Design a protein around this ligand. Structure first.
Ligand SMILES: [Cl-]
Ligand SMILES: [Mg+2]
Ligand code: NA
Length: 354
């Protein structure tokens, strides 16, 4: 029988000379077995949802801080670092941002002068959201996801920027405003990140590379690149991950791995195992080999990698299950972490603690 997580050596202790070991959390996960695992294994946390724009400012000028504050207070009490996720995203963002003075979607406006007025209004709203949040949390946050997922996976425009509402309304200016505002209110020492997934693979990797070089050349304050690392057992390759981190380090940017999970499935994730107990032990072994290689690499890159955060704690809670159910008629279970649903260690744990 595998031991419980609190009975084995701490991942944070294991990696103390290399990088933080973090987890994404909800306020309800700060106690019980999850809270115990958190305190034992991790020295950094991030909010899975509580610090997203819709979670903090759900209506204009109506700020709701309780969940985010609970996470901050836990980080303080437990001497953990804290990543802020996220100031800007095109999901989990309230629609009121993108409505004009008449209450209609800014994207539908056809008068270009009115479009420019809408751009200014949205950028003002964005400045206010960032100022208010940053002023509250600036003494607690150790890395800010200033913008999230602003780069496209394909090439819909020359710069490979995601054509979300932010882009449709403001072009790239929301990205500049976000970084400049975060710097202004968080201070000169605050570590400002651009976060994205599929940062290991092109064309996205190069769109992001070009975007950061463009920002930097314009004096936009950017300190680091967040690699979500929603990955699989076989993809992307170790050398793909390596090359991406080296590219960003070459620009003088920090790397963080921000949302790590190693799914048991390819894309699309079907067919999925219908329950956790249906998952064959061999698949956990393949995951363990993957995890060993990933953490060997992260250690190799530790002069340019400051923090490695998993997108959850243990296999009882993961957004990958929603994904599995979506592609398998409501039934399916993934298992992306080194701790199982009862907080026992998995084969992967043993291969990254050694
Ligand atoms: Cl989009
Ligand atoms: Mg190992
Ligand atoms: Na490091």
């Amino acid at each position: 029988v595998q031991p419980f997580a609190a009975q084995v050596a701490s991942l944070a202790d294991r990696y103390e000379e290399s990088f933080d070991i973090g987890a994404a959390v909800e306020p309800h996960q700060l106690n019980g077995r999850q809270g115990k695992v958190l305190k034992h294994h991790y020295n950094s946390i991030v909010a899975e949802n509580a610090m997203k724009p819709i979670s903090l400012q759900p209506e204009e000028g109506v700020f709701t801080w309780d969940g985010a504050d609970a996470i901050v207070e836990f980080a303080r009490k437990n001497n953990m670092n804290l990543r802020f996720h996220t100031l800007v995203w095109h999901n989990q963002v309230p629609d009121w941002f993108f409505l004009d003075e008449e209450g209609n979607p800014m994207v539908e406006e056809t008068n270009e002068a009115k479009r420019q007025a809408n751009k200014e209004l949205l950028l003002e709203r964005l400045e206010t959201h960032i100022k208010t949040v940053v002023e509250r949390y600036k003494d607690d946050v150790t890395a800010w996801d200033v913008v999230n997922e602003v780069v496209d996976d394909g090439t819909p425009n020359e710069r490979g920027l995601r054509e979300s509402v932010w882009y449709q309304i403001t072009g790239d200016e929301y990205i500049r405003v976000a970084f400049e505002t975060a710097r202004k209110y968080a201070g000169e020492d605050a570590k400002l990140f651009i976060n994205d997934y599929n940062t290991e693979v092109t064309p996205k990797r190069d769109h992001l590379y070009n975007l950061v070089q463009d920002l930097l050349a314009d004096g936009v304050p950017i300190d680091g690149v967040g690699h979500q690392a929603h990955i699989q057992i076989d993809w992307p390759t170790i050398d793909e991950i390596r090359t991406s981190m080296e590219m960003f380090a070459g620009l003088g940017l920090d790397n963080q791995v921000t949302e790590l999970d190693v799914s048991l499935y390819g894309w699309p994730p079907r067919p999925a195992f219908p329950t956790y107990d249906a998952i064959p032990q061999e698949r956990f072994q393949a995951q363990a080999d993957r995890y060993n290689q990933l953490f060997e690499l992260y250690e190799e890159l530790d002069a340019d990698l400051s923090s490695v955060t998993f997108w959850g704690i243990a296999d009882n809670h993961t957004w990958l299950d929603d994904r599995a159910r979506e592609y398998n008629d409501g039934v399916g279970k993934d298992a992306p972490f080194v701790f199982d649903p009862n907080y026992r260690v998995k084969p992967a744990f043993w291969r990254i603690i050694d």
